[PDB]
C-alpha cells in the first residue's frame, strides 16, 4: 500500500531526490534539487486531485 520512499543522486554536486510513493497503484515521482522541485507526475499522469468530482 501507501509507501514512502525516495531515490537520491550526486550530480555534479546535485542532490536530486526523487520522492517514489506507491498507493493505490500509483507512483508519485518528484525530483528535487537544492530544496527545489522541477518535476512531479503520478504514475505519469501531472495532476493533483479533483475531490470535487473524485
Not at 40 to 48: D, P, S, V, W, Y
Amino acid at each position: 500500500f501507501k509507501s514512502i520512499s525516495t531515490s537520491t543522486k550526486m550530480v555534479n554536486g546535485r542532490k536530486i531526490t526523487t520522492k517514489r510513493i506507491v498507493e493505490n497503484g500509483q507512483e508519485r515521482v518528484e525530483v528535487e534539487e537544492d530544496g527545489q522541485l522541477k518535476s512531479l507526475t503520478i504514475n505519469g499522469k501531472e495532476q493533483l486531485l479533483r475531490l470535487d468530482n473524485k
